[PDB]
Write a protein that binds this ligand. Structure first.
Ligand SMILES: CCCCCCCC/C=C\CCCCCCCC(=O)O[C@H](COC(=O)CCCCCCCCCCCCCCC)COP(=O)(O)OC[C@@H](O)CO
Ligand SMILES: CCCCCCCC/C=C\CCCCCCCC(=O)O[C@H](COC(=O)CCCCCCCCCCCCCCC)COP(=O)(O)OC[C@@H](O)CO
Ligand SMILES: CCCCCCCC/C=C\CCCCCCCC(=O)O[C@H](COC(=O)CCCCCCCCCCCCCCC)COP(=O)(O)OC[C@@H](O)CO
Ligand SMILES: CCCCCCCC/C=C\CCCCCCCC(=O)O[C@H](COC(=O)CCCCCCCCCCCCCCC)COP(=O)(O)OC[C@@H](O)CO
Ligand SMILES: CCCCCCCC/C=C\CCCCCCCC(=O)O[C@H](COC(=O)CCCCCCCCCCCCCCC)COP(=O)(O)OC[C@@H](O)CO
Ligand SMILES: CCCCCCCC/C=C\CCCCCCCC(=O)O[C@H](COC(=O)CCCCCCCCCCCCCCC)COP(=O)(O)OC[C@@H](O)CO
Ligand SMILES: CCCCCCCC/C=C\CCCCCCCC(=O)O[C@H](COC(=O)CCCCCCCCCCCCCCC)COP(=O)(O)OC[C@@H](O)CO
Ligand SMILES: CCCCCCCC/C=C\CCCCCCCC(=O)O[C@H](COC(=O)CCCCCCCCCCCCCCC)COP(=O)(O)OC[C@@H](O)CO
Ligand SMILES: Nc1ncnc2c1ncn2[C@@H]1O[C@@H]2COP(=O)(O)O[C@H]2[C@H]1O
Ligand SMILES: Nc1ncnc2c1ncn2[C@@H]1O[C@@H]2COP(=O)(O)O[C@H]2[C@H]1O
Lengths: 398, 398, 398, 398
């Protein structure tokens, strides 16, 4: 974090400049007691080119704002049209904005941070415009307080497109300035309106995407006027998904990363099911790499028929959270309850037999769907695991 | 509904507070005759933590607004900067908004309800800002009526970005407040503009999606300048779809729910075709589970050629609404008219024969497309149903 | 068009009412010389229930606006709060808007027509609000002209959120009205802003979709800095597509219509290629139905290698516009030029031989891609066509 | 570029007209010393019909603006309602806008250029409206400077919806004009708001699409709270993609161009890998055409396991940038480092053998994924290349 302090310091110094130079263009009486601050600021502004690790079509602003055009124009008392060149330090704003965009810790939303940057920019521009309006005013015997408060109030009035009209321009040189910043205020307010209009669907993107996905389903299903119990259980499933995965589907996000990053993410996510399954306890460094990407999580409600008897289902379902009970062919007797760690349906592919009994969940079971092809591949590739699987299968037969 | 009344009561009491505290900050003469209401309100505010079924990073506002900072600041007559702490009750707004978001009966559109919440929030903020503006006003001998009406009129003027300018700030302490709420009014108006700009395509989402889908097809087809009779029949089909399914495709909505919820929804929707088809009358608890998801509804116009003679079509079409006639190879003689309940094309897969005669609808027939693979699977899985199907096939031969 | 005149008449009469009733609420001196117009209007308003081919949750406004509450309140000179009931005729606006939405000849864009309806509604509301503001004004000796022009000017000032402030409310009963229509003006201006913000990408949807599709390709390809000749020819192809199909892909629009409408549209579009190809001149009523949906149009530039020698291409390319030349294995000698009507590549599937010579277009050739599977199916289904195709193939061998 | 100068000249002359005619409608004293400019302008306006390579429903404005209605109305001193016809030259604006839309060199963004055109149009309309407002003003002894500056200031006030209210209409003929341009200002400001609201996501579309794609992945992955080293390497991969391909996937853009343009683009992009690979140095004109479209670039991090031992991988990976090392079965000894130019995994399909050793990258390797099917096709189609590949394979065995 040796660069976070430096970046904070550079942001503070560039903000100090952007606040300070116009305020002394209007008020030449300043700049006399603030010389050490300006000296330190100039030193910091020149001392960032070697610390940021030459001329570029995009890295020019750094040198354009490091040159000491300040502390010289006031010193020689140049005329205002010629002393206006001191505003070059305002070009450092682009560089500090880019730097703050390239460094983060919270990972702020790009649209919300863009709106924050626009808020900062419009506040800074409001201060600059207020100072400018104050500059071309008739001389008066007023304190700088009320004289600046009135100017800032007028600038915020025009840039907000409110326009009370209590104070208005009265000279042509003021009228041209009023027109220019009226147009700029229209543009800036338009940019802000567009920024909120875009941002309303950018913050907590999952929280809005899940809501929009649920809304259409609920509307159509309520229009069909289906049984309210089904409504209740569907809404319960959807809010449980909201609580567990935050309205996510894994393939919605992992289908962009390349293969090794995808493998690493899958391992760091499914280390749990790697750690609790009996035959996966140190089964192999490679085997987990082949299998971990294929397990597709499935979610079932409290009492739903997982697999009915007589079916030709050839897929093994693992358990990550929940208890599962199996009901035999007499639909009265249950063999046992299968909590986390075990699975069911093993005697479907190896044994080439139909579903011996109906299996149903209890409250909410997090499963792991595995396709028959992957199961066949791992059985034909790893023999000890196939031997163990047949061992538990023949044990469950007894 | 024992919680709906409680939630309505909590909304009413928090709205009463949000309206009441600032109005007595400006007017200390109140709070003397409204003590029982405040006592009951305080009791209700503390009596919701055990009735909502500890400290949390998101459940803090409940305790922050339950603490009785009210009925004490006015009692001891604290100074205004120190008595300003009584506004903590306004944090209950977040909790009541969240609660109202989590409970519904009409299933209001999230964007429209968000706009309603924003309307309520901006009205409440307008009242608060009006009371605040009234607070820092010069003392005058005016009734509280006109004195509050003028303040609210001014607040609604600034927050709407209209600014007539009949009444304007005249002191620096008023000018700073004017600037602050000018910025807040810009932000709030921007939020409202974004909310309507988003909401214009959120209410009755089907009614707009269907319109947008129809518009491009109609525009292109009219550009091609094809025969107007085809225009008329296409538009008739589209409006019939609007009337029947409200511009919906089943797979557009069912492709997100898991398998058992999808099965349950399919049964609750297609119980009709389950109930009228002759061989589906109590055919089996399981068989309907296998078949009901695959029947794809198809819609044909008044006179369209369903299946022409000589084709190798191997799909059975059911009937849900409408009459279908079959024209023989002499294109003059019709065998009969097939109303709801029966089907056609059975002697295509079992008999391995081509289409014996042309079949056409009459006005608008709702069919049920079934693929050859599913038909083969059910024939090879259920034998009595295959026997019955061959029975009606050989009967129709005679 | 016997209903277009009736709908125009009903729109005219409801607009006349919506303009007329408030203007006589403010001005009671009217309604004396306009009795025949009101009588005819009332007759027309009651005489539409049997001509529109009972009580409904959505068809209530028709009866609510047909009842003659007008011509009675002015007759008995009811008090203003009680005579305010005459505004029920304004509910006919919903019905006329719905009717105009359900009938069209130009097929106006739904968003642009929605904006036109909103423009009409806001103008009508501006007139109503101006009349209302005029109602609660102090009595004065002014002509109704200037007295209404000032009121309408004020109403358009507030609803536009401009607020000059030359004329402002001065009584509490006026101030409440000012606040109410200030809020309504905010809402209406927000709706208008959202409507344009949505409409900017709704008019001539093809003209914008094609532009957006071309822009990304051009930007990326220019970024790669590839040879400018390729830029020129790619842009030429894209503008030719703009001129010919208006930036369309057939499957983008036909993938929503059902099978028979799709067949009919395909026939009405490809009757040209049906009419010019030698072996398609009355080939068969059914054969065109099987083939016409599969021909995929392909577009090639001036000189592009259609099919090179030595390839295993097994697809027949038809010609709809353009000349095609074939270059032999000596890359100097051309057999002929193939204009519209014929095809090439026939001796690829029947003969099971590789591409005998290279074939290239001349300026811009509109082809018709046909897959090998469909060609095989039609050859194995229709024998005379296969005989003819082999006849031209063996002829081209000689 | 013989037409760029002509188009610039026509834009300049039409802008000069649009600025000039209303300014002399208000000020008849002009048009006396500017006759040569108007003569040259008229000549240029008539001399563009034969230089643009008759009557059309869309090409009418050219003739409507070429006719010399100017230099005649002022000459005969027609009355203002009758001399108002001179504004026909403003219809040339549509044609110049269309022409500038059809010709470009920078390939400006259509939305940003549309906003620039709207800015130009609203500025021109502001000038026209200011001149119009100046026209119907009471006569006064004021210089044309202040008299026009005030009018333009007022016009920019109304069209920005600010409305200070320092200068307001005072006559009914002025009030009607004020209402008309108030409505027009509402419409124009709405259009501008919509244009920025759309443009915020149109400039540098790749720069925003890549950011939005990265944001959701980063948010979800940080929510899972996976190991920060994986965060660092994933972010490094994403920024490297930003630097190399600018956040692009080739199939995202090439899946719209037809086959020959796609082939040409692929050759112009992959001429590098064509030029450096040993066996691709002039391998064949056709072979590169078959292979160049299939090579899919893959990117791996510094140390990632490319292909582990014991796998059945049958795909050859080429090298475009980076060094690759292979670790043997003793996981301590490396055979060599494979820099750009060579490949690995050749002895996987020809030899029908499993992966002899583990292969890993070093810093960041740009590969070229080739499917087994394409490799088999080229081996069975080109025999010398297969002989050479087997030669290097058997050499690498030794
Ligand atoms: C532009 C201002 C034009 C002022 C013209 C000028 O020089 O005025 C004379 C005196 O001004 C003087 O001494 C001083 C004249 C200028 C003093 C004020 C300049 C403020 C410029 C704000 C730019 C912000 C850019 C964006 C920042 C984020 C008289
Ligand atoms: C709180 C924020 C700062 C408020 C500063 C402020 O109000 O300044 C007053 C003086 O004006 C002065 O010197 C004013 C000097 C400048 C102060 C800051 C002006 C810009 C405020 C920008 C706000 C942005 C919000 C986001 C202080 O005296 P008081 O309060 O008694 O006023 C009445 C008195 O002046 C006469 O009875
Ligand atoms: C902020 C207001 C600043 C008022 C400053 C203040 O204390 O004024 C003195 C007297 O005020 C007094 O007795 C009383 C001063 C304060 C009285 C008015 C406070 C209103 C705050 C509205 C917040 C709404 C939040 C959002 C609600 C939805 C003098
Ligand atoms: C209807 C809504 C409430 C209207 C309340 C209202 O108008 O109050 C008047 C008095 O002012 C008073 O006390 C005013 C006291 C406060 C009343 C409410 C002010 C806020 C209105 C917020 C509207 C939001 C709309 C969404 C009543 O007297 P009247 O009418 O004869 O006026 C003229 C008379 O005062 C002198 O000739
Ligand atoms: C609401 C107006 C409130 C006027 C209150 C009222 O009755 O005023 C008395 C006299 O008014 C009178 O005779 C007459 C009072 C009312 C006269 C004006 C009513 C205009 C209502 C516009 C609604 C448009 C709806 C949308 C249309 C598209 C005194
Ligand atoms: C053109 C549109 C209609 C313009 C109607 C108009 O201007 O009316 C004037 C009179 O005011 C009257 O009676 C006014 C009576 C009402 C006229 C219409 C007012 C609403 C206009 C809504 C526009 C919407 C645009 C979209 C006519 O006299 P003139 O012109 O010499 O004025 C000066 C004279 O009155 C004194 O020197
Ligand atoms: C509309 C203006 C109505 C002016 C009516 C008029 O003729 O006024 C008389 C004198 O005006 C006169 O001599 C001259 C009357 C007209 C002089 C001003 C006309 C300006 C029209 C701007 C249109 C811009 C279109 C879009 C441009 C991009 C009195
Ligand atoms: C800079 C832009 C042009 C500014 C032109 C300008 O200001 O014109 C003044 C005169 O007014 C005149 O003749 C004015 C004649 C018209 C000048 C241009 C008006 C429209 C400006 C549109 C801006 C769009 C921005 C985007 C010049 O004198 P000065 O400055 O000393 O003023 C005070 C003096 O007039 C009395 O002390
Ligand atoms: N005795 C048993 N106790 C618990 N589970 C069992 C028992 N016998 C079988 N099962 C499981 O119940 C499942 C239901 O039928 P399957 O073919 O899916 O595979 C079966 C086994 O996994
Ligand atoms: N005598 C008949 N009466 C009614 N329908 C018939 C008769 N004979 C055949 N059909 C139906 O007409 C259909 C047309 O040919 P298919 O092969 O589709 O299957 C045929 C039967 O379903």
């Amino acid at each position: 974090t040796y660069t976070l302090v430096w970046k904070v310091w550079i942001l503070a110094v560039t903000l100090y400049f952007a606040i300070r130079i116009p305020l002394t263009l209007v008020f030449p009486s300043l700049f006399s007691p603030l010389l050490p601050l300006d000296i330190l600021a100039s030193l910091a502004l020149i001392a960032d080119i070697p610390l940021d690790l030459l001329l570029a079509p995009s890295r020019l602003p750094d040198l354009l704002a490091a040159l000491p055009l300040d502390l010289l124009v006031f010193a020689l008392h140049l005329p205002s049209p010629l002393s206006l060149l001191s505003l070059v330090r305002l070009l450092k704003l682009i560089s500090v904005q880019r730097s703050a965009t390239r460094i983060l810790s919270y990972r702020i939303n790009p649209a919300l941070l863009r709106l924050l940057s626009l808020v900062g920019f419009i506040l800074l521009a409001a201060h600059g415009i207020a100072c400018g309006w104050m500059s071309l005013q008739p001389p008066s015997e007023n304190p700088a307080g009320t004289r600046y408060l009135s100017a800032f109030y007028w600038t915020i009035t025009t840039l907000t497109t409110i326009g009370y009209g209590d104070i208005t321009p009265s000279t042509p040189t003021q009228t041209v300035y009023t027109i220019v910043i009226e147009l700029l205020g229209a543009a800036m307010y338009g940019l802000v309106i567009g920024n909120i209009a875009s941002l309303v669907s950018k913050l907590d993107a999952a929280k809005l995407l899940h809501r929009e996905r649920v809304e259409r389903v609920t509307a159509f299903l309520s229009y069909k006027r289906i049984s309210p119990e089904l409504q209740r259980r569907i809404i319960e499933y959807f809010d449980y998904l909201w609580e567990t995965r935050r309205g996510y589907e894994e393939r919605e996000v992992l289908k962009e990363l390349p293969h090794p990053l995808r493998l690493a993410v899958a391992m760091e996510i499914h280390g749990d099911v790697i750690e609790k399954v009996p035959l996966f306890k140190g089964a192999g460094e490679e085997f987990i790499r082949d299998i971990i990407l294929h397990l597709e999580p499935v979610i079932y409600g409290p009492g739903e028929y997982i697999i009915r008897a007589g079916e030709m289902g050839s897929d093994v379902y693992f358990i990550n959270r929940g208890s599962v009970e199996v009901l035999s062919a007499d639909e009265k007797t249950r063999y046992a309850i299968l909590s986390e760690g075990q699975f069911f349906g093993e005697m479907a592919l190896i044994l080439r037999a139909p579903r011996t009994a109906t299996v149903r969940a209890r409250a909410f079971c997090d499963l792991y769907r595995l396709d028959k092809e992957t199961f066949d591949r791992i059985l034909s590739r790893y023999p000890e695991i196939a031997a163990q699987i047949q061992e538990l299968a023949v044990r469950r037969k007894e």
